[PDB]
Symmetry: C2
Subunit: 112 residues, 2 copies
Amino acid sequence: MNLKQIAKDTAKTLQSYLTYQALRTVLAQLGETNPPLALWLHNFSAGQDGEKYIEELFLEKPDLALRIMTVREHIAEEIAEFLPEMVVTGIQQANMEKRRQHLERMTQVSLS
Amino acid sequence: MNLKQIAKDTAKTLQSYLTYQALRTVLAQLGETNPPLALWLHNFSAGQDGEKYIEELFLEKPDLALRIMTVREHIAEEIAEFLPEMVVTGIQQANMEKRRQHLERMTQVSLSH
């Protein structure tokens, strides 16, 4: 169990997923503002490890890459502080749904 | 935009990823003390929303689902507190290296002769 490699890989996976989220937000925002570019961006994007995506966008439309950069970072800065509790308590509760499900099934059988 | 959904969906993805990562380390803790079980687990596993994965393992080998449950929770406990800084600063750096790459290129072009 390489706890330090797991953390690295998790952080990476999260940066990439938030770039993804930054990508749909701007897609939306550009659906209402400049639908020709919005379609282009829809068109451009399919396939994204978040860093490789942005690097590719930067060559085509720099100002557009900057904007994904701004959003992914504004999103991260807003949600980050909640991640630990959500995930630790989320796993703990979900761990517990399963044991309680198993106990009901067990109790439904034995007591019927 | 919908920050509340984004946080929920991020958490859920994270939670799924850590289950996946829990699987890898038990898969390898057994790789030692039981290759039949290991291969069984390996075979069963290919194809992975982490809660649906565990609910399915629970019907075949409850004790093995419980072990994944325990390892997933342990991993999260250990790494969770670092994640906020790692993501916020990882993005800020990667953002910044992207501006510096662009500057250095501009610099390479305007100044080279």
